[PDB]
mmCIF file of C-alpha atoms and ligand atoms in Angstrom:
data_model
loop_
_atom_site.group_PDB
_atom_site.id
_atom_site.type_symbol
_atom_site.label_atom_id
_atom_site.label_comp_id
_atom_site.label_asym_id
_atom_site.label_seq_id
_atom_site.Cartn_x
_atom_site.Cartn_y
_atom_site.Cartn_z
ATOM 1 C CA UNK A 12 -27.897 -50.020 50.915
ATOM 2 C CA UNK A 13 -30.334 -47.368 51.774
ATOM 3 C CA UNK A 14 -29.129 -45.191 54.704
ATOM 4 C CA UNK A 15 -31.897 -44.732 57.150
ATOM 5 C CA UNK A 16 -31.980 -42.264 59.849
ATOM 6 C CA UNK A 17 -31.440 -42.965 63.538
ATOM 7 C CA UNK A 18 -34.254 -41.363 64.909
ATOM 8 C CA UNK A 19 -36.355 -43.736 62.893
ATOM 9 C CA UNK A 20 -34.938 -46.832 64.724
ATOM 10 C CA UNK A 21 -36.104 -47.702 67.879
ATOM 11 C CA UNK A 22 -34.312 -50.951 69.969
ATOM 12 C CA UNK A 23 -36.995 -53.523 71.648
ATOM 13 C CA UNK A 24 -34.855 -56.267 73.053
ATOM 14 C CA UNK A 25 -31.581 -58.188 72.936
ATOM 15 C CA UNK A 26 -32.279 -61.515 71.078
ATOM 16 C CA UNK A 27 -28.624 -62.760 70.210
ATOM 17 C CA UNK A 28 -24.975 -62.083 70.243
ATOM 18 C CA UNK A 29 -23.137 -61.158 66.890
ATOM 19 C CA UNK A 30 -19.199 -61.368 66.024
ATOM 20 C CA UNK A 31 -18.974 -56.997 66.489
ATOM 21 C CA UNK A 32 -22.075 -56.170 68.554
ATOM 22 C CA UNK A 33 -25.584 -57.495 68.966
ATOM 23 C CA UNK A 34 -28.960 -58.579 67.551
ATOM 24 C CA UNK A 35 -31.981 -56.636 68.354
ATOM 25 C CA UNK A 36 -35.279 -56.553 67.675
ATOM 26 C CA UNK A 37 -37.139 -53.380 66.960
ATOM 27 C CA UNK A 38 -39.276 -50.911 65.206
ATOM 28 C CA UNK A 39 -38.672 -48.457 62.381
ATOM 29 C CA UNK A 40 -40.765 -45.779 61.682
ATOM 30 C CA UNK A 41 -40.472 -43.757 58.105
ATOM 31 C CA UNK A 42 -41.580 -39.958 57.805
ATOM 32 C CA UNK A 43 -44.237 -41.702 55.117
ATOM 33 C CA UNK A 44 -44.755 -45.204 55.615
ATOM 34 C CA UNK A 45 -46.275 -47.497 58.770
ATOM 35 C CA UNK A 46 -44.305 -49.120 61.253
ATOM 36 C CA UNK A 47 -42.544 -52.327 61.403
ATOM 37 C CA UNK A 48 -40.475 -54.241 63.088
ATOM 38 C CA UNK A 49 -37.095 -55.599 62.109
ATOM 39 C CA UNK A 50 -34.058 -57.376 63.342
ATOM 40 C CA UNK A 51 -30.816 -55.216 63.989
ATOM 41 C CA UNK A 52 -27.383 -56.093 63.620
ATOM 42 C CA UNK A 53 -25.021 -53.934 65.547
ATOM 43 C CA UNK A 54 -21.696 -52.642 65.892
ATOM 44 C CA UNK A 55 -20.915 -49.975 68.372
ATOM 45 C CA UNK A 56 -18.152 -48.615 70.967
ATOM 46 C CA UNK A 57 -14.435 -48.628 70.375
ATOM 47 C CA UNK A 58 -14.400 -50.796 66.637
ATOM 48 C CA UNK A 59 -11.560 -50.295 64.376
ATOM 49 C CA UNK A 60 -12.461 -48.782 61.027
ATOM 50 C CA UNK A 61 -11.783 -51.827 59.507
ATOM 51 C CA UNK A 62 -13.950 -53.561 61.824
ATOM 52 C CA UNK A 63 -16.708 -51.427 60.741
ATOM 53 C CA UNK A 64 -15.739 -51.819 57.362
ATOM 54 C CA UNK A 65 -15.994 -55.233 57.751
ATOM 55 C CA UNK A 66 -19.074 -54.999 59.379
ATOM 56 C CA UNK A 67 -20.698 -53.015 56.645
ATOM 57 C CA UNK A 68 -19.244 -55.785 53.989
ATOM 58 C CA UNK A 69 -22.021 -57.674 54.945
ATOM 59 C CA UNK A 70 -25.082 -55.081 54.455
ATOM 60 C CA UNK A 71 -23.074 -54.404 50.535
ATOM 61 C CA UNK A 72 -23.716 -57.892 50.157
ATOM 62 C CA UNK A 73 -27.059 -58.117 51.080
ATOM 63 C CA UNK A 74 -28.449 -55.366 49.081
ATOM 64 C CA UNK A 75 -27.589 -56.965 46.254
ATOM 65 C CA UNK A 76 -30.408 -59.774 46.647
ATOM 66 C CA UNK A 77 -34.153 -59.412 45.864
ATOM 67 C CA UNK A 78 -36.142 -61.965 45.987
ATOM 68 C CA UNK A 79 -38.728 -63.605 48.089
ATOM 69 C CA UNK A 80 -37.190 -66.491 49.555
ATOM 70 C CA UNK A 81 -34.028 -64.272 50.807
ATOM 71 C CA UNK A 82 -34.286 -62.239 53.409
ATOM 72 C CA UNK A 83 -34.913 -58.684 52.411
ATOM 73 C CA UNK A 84 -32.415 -55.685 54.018
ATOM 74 C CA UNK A 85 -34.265 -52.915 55.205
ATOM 75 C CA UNK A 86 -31.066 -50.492 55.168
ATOM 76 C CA UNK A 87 -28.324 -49.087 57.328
ATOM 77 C CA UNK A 88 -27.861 -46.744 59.846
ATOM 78 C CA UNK A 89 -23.913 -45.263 59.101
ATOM 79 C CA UNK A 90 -23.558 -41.273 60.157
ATOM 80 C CA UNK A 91 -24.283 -42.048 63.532
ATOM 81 C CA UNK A 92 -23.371 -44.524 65.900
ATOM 82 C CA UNK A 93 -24.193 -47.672 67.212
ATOM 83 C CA UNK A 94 -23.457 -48.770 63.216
ATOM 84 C CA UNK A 95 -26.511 -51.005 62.309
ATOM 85 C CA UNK A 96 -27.976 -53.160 59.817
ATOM 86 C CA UNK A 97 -31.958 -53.736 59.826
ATOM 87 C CA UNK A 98 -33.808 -56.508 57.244
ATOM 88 C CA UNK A 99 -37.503 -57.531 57.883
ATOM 89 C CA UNK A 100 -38.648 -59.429 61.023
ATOM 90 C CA UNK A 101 -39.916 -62.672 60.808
ATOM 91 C CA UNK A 102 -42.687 -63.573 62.940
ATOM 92 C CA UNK A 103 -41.784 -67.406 63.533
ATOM 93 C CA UNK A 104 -38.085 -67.180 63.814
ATOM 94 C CA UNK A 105 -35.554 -69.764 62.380
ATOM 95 C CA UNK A 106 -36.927 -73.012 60.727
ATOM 96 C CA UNK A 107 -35.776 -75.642 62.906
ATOM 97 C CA UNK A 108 -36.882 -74.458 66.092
ATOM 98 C CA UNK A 109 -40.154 -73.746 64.588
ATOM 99 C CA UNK A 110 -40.347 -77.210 63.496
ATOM 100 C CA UNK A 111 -39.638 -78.340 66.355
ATOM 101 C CA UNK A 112 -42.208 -76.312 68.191
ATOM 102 C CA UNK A 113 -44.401 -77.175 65.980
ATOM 103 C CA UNK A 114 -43.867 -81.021 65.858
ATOM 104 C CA UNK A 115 -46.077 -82.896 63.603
ATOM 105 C CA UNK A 116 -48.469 -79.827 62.638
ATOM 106 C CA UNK A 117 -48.152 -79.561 58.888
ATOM 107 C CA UNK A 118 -49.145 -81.574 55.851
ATOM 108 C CA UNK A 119 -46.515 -82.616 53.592
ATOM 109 C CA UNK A 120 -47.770 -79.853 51.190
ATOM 110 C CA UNK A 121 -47.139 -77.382 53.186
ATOM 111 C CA UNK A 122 -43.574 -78.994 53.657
ATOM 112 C CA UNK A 123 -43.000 -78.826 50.151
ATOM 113 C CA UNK A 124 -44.097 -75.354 49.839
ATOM 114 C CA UNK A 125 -41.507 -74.128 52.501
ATOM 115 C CA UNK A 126 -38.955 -76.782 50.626
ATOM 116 C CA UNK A 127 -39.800 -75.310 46.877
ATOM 117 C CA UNK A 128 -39.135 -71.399 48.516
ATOM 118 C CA UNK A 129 -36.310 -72.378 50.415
ATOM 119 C CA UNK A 130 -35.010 -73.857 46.571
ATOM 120 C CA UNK A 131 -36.080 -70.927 44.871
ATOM 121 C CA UNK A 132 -34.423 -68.296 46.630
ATOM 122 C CA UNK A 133 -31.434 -71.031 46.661
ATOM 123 C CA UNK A 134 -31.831 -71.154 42.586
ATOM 124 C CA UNK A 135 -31.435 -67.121 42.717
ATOM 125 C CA UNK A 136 -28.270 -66.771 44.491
ATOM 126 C CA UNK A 137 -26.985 -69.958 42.873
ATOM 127 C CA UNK A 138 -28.076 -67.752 39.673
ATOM 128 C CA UNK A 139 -26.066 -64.450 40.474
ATOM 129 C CA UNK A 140 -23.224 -67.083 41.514
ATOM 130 C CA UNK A 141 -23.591 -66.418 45.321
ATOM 131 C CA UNK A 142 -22.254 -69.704 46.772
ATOM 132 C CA UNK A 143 -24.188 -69.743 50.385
ATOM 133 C CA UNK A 144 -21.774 -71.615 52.393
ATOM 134 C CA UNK A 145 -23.859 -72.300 55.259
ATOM 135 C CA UNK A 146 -27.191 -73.294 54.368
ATOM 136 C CA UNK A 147 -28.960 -75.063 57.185
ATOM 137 C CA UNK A 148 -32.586 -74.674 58.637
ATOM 138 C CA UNK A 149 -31.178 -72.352 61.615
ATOM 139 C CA UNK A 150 -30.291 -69.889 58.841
ATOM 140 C CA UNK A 151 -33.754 -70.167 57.379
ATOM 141 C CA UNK A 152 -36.255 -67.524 58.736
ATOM 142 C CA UNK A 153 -40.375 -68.486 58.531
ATOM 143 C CA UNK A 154 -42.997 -65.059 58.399
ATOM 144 C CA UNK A 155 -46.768 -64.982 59.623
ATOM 145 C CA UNK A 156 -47.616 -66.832 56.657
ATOM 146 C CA UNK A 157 -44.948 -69.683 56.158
ATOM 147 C CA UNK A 158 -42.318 -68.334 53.439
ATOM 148 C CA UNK A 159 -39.107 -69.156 54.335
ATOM 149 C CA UNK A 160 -36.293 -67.041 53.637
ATOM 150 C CA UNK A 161 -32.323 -67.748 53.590
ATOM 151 C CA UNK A 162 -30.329 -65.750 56.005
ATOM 152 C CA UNK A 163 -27.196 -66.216 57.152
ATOM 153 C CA UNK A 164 -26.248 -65.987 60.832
ATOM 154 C CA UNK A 165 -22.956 -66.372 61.036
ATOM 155 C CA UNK A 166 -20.990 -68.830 63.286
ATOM 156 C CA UNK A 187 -18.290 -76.167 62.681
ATOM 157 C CA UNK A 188 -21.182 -76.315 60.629
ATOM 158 C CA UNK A 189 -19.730 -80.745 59.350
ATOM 159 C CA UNK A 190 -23.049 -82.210 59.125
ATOM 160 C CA UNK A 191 -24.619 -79.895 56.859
ATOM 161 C CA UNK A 192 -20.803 -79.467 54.583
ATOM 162 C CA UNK A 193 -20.662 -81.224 51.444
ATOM 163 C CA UNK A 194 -17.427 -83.803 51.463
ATOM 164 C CA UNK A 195 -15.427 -82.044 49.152
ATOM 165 C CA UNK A 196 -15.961 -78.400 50.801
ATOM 166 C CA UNK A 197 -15.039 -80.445 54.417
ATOM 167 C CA UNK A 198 -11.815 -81.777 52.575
ATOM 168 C CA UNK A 199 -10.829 -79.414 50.555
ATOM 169 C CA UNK A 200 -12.304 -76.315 50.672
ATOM 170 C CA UNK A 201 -13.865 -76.703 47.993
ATOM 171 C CA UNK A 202 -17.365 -74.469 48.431
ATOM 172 C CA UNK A 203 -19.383 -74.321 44.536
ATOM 173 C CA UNK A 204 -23.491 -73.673 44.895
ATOM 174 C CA UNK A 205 -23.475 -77.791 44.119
ATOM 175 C CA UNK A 206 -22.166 -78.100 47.802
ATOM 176 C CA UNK A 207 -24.740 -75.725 48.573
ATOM 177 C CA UNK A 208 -26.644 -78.657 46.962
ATOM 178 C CA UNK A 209 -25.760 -81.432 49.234
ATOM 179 C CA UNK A 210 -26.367 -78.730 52.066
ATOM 180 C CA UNK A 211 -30.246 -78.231 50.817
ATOM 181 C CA UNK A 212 -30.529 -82.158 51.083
ATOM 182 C CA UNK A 213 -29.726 -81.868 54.731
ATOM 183 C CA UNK A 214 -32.508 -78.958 55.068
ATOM 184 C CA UNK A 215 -35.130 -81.253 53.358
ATOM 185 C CA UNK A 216 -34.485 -84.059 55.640
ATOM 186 C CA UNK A 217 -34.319 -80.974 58.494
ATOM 187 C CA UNK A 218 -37.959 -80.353 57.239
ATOM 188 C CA UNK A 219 -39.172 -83.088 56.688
ATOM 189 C CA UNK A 220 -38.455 -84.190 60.469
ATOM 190 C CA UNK A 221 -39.222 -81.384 61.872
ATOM 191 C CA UNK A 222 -36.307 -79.932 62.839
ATOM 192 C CA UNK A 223 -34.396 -83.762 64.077
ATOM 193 C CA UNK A 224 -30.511 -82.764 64.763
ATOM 194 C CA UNK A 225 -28.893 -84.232 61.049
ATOM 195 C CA UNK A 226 -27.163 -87.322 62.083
ATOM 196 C CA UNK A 227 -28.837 -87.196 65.549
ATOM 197 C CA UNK A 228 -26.018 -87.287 68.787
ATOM 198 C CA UNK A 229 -23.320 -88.961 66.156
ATOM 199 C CA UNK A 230 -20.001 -86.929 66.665
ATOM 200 C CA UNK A 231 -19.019 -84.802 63.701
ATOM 201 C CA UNK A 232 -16.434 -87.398 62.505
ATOM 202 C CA UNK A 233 -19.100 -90.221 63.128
ATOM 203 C CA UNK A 234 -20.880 -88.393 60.582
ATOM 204 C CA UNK A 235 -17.825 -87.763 58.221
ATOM 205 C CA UNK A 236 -16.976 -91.873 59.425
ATOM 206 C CA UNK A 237 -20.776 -92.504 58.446
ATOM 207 C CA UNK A 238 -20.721 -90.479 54.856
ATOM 208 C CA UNK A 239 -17.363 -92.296 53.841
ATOM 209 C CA UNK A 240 -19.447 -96.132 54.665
ATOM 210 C CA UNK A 241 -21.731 -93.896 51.698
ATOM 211 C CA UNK A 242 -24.557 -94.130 54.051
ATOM 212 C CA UNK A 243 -26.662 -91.599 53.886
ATOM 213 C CA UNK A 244 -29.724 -89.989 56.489
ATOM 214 C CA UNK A 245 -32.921 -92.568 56.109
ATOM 215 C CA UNK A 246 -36.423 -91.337 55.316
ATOM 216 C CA UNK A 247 -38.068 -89.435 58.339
ATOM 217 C CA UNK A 248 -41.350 -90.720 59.464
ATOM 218 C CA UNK A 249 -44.341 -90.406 56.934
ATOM 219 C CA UNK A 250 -41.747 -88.491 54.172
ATOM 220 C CA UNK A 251 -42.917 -89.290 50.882
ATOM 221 C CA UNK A 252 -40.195 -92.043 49.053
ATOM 222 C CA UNK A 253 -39.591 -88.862 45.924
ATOM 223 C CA UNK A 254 -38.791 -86.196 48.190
ATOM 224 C CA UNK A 255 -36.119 -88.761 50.304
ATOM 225 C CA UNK A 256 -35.151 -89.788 46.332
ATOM 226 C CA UNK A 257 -34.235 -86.141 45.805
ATOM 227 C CA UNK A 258 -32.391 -85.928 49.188
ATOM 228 C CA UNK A 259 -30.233 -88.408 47.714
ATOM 229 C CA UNK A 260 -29.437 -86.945 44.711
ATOM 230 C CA UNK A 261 -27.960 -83.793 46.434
ATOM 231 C CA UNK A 262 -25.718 -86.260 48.746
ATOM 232 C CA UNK A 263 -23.750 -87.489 45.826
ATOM 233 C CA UNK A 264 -20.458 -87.527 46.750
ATOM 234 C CA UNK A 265 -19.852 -86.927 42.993
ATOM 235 C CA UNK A 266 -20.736 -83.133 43.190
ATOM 236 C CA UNK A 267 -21.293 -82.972 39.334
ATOM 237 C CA UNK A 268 -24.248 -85.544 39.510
ATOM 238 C CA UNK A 269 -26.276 -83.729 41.953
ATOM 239 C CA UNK A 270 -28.869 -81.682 40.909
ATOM 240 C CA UNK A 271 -29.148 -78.302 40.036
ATOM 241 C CA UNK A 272 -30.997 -75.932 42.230
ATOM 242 C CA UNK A 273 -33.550 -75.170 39.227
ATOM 243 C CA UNK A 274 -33.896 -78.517 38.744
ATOM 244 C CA UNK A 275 -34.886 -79.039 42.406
ATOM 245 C CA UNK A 276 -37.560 -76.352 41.800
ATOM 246 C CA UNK A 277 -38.854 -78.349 38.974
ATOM 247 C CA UNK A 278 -38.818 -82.022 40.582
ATOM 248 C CA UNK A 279 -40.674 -80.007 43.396
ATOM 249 C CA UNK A 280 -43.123 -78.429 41.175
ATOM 250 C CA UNK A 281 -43.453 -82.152 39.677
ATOM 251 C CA UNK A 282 -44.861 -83.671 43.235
ATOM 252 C CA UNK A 283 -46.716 -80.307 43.626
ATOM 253 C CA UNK A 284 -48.746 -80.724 40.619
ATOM 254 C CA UNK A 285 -49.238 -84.476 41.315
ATOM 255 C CA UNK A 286 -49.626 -84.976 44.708
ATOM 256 C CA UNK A 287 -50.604 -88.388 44.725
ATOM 257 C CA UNK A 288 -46.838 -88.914 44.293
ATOM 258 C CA UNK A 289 -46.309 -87.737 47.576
ATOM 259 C CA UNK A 290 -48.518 -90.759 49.245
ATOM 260 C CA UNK A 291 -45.964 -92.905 48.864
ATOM 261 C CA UNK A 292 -44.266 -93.479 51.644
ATOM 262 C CA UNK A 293 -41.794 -96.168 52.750
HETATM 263 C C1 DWT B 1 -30.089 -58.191 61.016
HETATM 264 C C2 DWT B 1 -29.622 -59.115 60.022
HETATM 265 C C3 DWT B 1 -28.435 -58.885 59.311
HETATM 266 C C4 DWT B 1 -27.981 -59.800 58.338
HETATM 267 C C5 DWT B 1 -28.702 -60.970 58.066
HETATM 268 C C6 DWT B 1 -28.334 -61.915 57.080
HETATM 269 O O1 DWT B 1 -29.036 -62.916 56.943
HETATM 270 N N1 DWT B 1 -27.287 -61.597 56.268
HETATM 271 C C7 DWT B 1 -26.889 -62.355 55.194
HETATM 272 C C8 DWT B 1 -25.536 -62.315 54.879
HETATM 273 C C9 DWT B 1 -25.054 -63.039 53.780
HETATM 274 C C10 DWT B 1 -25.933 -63.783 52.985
HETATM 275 C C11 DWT B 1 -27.302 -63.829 53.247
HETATM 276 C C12 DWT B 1 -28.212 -64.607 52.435
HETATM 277 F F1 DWT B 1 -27.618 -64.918 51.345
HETATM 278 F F2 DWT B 1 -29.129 -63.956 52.255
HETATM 279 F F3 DWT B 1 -28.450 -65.510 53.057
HETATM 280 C C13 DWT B 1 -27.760 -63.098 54.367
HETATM 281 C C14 DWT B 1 -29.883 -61.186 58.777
HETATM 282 C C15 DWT B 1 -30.336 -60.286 59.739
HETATM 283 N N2 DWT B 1 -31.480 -60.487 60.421
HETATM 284 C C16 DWT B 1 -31.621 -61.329 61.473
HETATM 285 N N3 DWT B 1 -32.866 -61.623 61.840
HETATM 286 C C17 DWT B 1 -33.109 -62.435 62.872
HETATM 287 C C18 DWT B 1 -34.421 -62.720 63.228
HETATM 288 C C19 DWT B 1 -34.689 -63.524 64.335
HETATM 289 C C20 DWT B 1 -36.019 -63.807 64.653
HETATM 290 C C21 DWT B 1 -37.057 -63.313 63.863
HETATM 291 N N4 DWT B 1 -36.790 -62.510 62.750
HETATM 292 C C22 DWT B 1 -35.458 -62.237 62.437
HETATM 293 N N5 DWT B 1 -32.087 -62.972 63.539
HETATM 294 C C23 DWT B 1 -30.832 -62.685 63.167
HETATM 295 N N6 DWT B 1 -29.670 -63.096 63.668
HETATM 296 N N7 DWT B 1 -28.752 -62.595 63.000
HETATM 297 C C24 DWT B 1 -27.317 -62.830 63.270
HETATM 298 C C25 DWT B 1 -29.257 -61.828 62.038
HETATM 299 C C26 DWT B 1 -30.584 -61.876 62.131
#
C-alpha cells in the first residue's frame, strides 16, 4: 500500500461509524496530480498496536486487488496519526440505496451491465481465491457513470449466506455464488429488502421448504433462471462466477432474450 502524506489529506465530513474509528469523506491532493475525493477509514487515539495492526490488515489486503469492478485503494496514511486508509469516492454511494432512490429508472440493460461488473470483479477475486464473505448490494459502490464496484463494509448478514456457510461455516467463492443471486434479485428490484420483513429464520424456514425469491416485476425469465442456479443448495451445481459473466454476455449480445418476462 502506497504511503501517502498527511498534509495531502484533507477531512470533509463524517459519513459512518467503523469498528476502530470513522468514515470520512475527503480530498487528497498530490504534489503532481489533481484533486480528488475519497472515502477514509480511520483509526486514531489510544488503539493498541495490535489494533492498528489489525486495522492496517485490511489496507494489505486491499492492495492486492486491481481491477475495475473492485474498489480501488488509494493508499495509507501510517507515520502520523489519525492511522487512515483512503480508496476512490464513489459518486452514487452503495447500490441498494441507489436503487432505491432511483426506483424504476433504468432499462434492464443497464441492469445487466451493473450485474455483468458486479460478476466480473466477483470472477477476479474468485480467481486469486479471495472468498468475499459478504457480498450484498450495500457493499457494492456505483461512480458518476454506473460501474459498480465490490467493497466490503464490515458489520447477521442470513439472507444473503449461502446454507452451508449459515450451518457450517463453510464460506468457498460458490457461497459467494448463492450470495451474487441475492444481489441480482437486489438489482433487479431495485434495492427490495431479500425476503422482504420475513425474520431471518423465516428465511432459513423458507430456504429449507426449497423455495426460493420469485421474479421481481418486469425481470426477464433468464436472468431469474440464473438466480436460481446460484441458490442451489447443492453448492457444486451452481455456477461459476466466469460462467455468470458468460450467460450475461449471452443475454447481452441477444437482447431479445431479455423480453421475456413472466
Ligand atoms: C475507506 C475504505 C476502506 C476499505 C474499503 C473496503 O471496501 N475494503 C475491503 C476490504 C476487504 C475486501 C474488499 C473487496 F474485496 F474489495 F471487497 C474491500 C472501502 C473503503 N471505502 C469506503 N467508501 C465508502 C463510500 C461511501 C459513499 C461513496 N463512496 C465511498 N464508504 C465506506 N464505508 N466503509 C466502511 C468504507 C467505505
Amino acid at each position: 500500500a502506497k504511503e501517502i502524506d498527511v498534509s495531502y489529506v484533507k477531512i470533509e465530513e463524517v459519513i459512518g461509524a467503523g469498528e476502530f474509528g470513522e468514515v470520512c469523506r475527503g480530498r487528497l491532493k498530490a504534489p503532481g496530480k489533481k484533486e480528488s475525493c475519497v472515502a477514509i477509514k480511520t483509526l486514531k487515539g489510544g488503539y493498541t498496536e495490535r489494533q492498528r495492526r489489525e486495522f492496517l490488515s485490511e489496507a494489505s489486503i486491499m492492495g492486492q486487488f486491481e481491477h475495475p469492478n473492485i474498489i480501488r485503494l488509494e493508499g495509507v496514511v501510517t507515520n502520523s496519526m489519525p492511522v487512515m486508509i483512503l480508496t476512490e469516492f464513489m459518486e452514487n454511494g452503495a447500490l441498494d440505496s441507489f436503487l432505491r432512490l432511483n426506483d424504476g429508472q433504468f432499462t434492464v440493460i443497464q441492469l445487466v451491465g451493473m450485474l455483468r461488473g458486479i460478476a466480473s470483479g466477483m470472477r477476479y477475486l474468485a480467481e486469486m481465491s479471495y472468498v468475499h464473505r459478504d457480498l450484498a448490494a450495500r457493499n457494492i459502490l456505483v461512480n458518476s457513470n454506473l460501474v459498480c464496484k465490490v467493497s466490503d463494509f464490515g458489520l447477521i448478514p442470513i439472507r444473503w449466506t449461502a446454507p452451508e456457510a449459515i450451518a457450517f461455516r463453510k464460506f468457498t467463492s460458490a457461497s459467494d455464488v448463492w450470495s451474487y443471486g441475492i444481489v441480482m434479485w437486489e438489482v433487479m428490484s431495485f434495492g427490495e429488502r431479500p425476503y422482504w420483513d420475513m425474520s431471518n429464520q423465516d428465511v432459513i424456514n423458507a430456504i429449507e421448504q426449497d423455495y426460493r425469491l420469485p421474479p421481481p416485476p418486469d425481470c426477464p425469465t433468464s436472468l431469474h433462471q440464473l438466480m436460481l442456479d446460484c441458490w442451489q443448495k447443492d453448492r457444486n451445481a451452481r455456477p461459476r462466477f466466469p460462467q455468470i459473466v458468460s450467460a450475461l454476455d449471452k443475454m447481452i449480445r441477444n437482447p431479445a432474450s431479455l423480453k421475456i418476462v413472466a
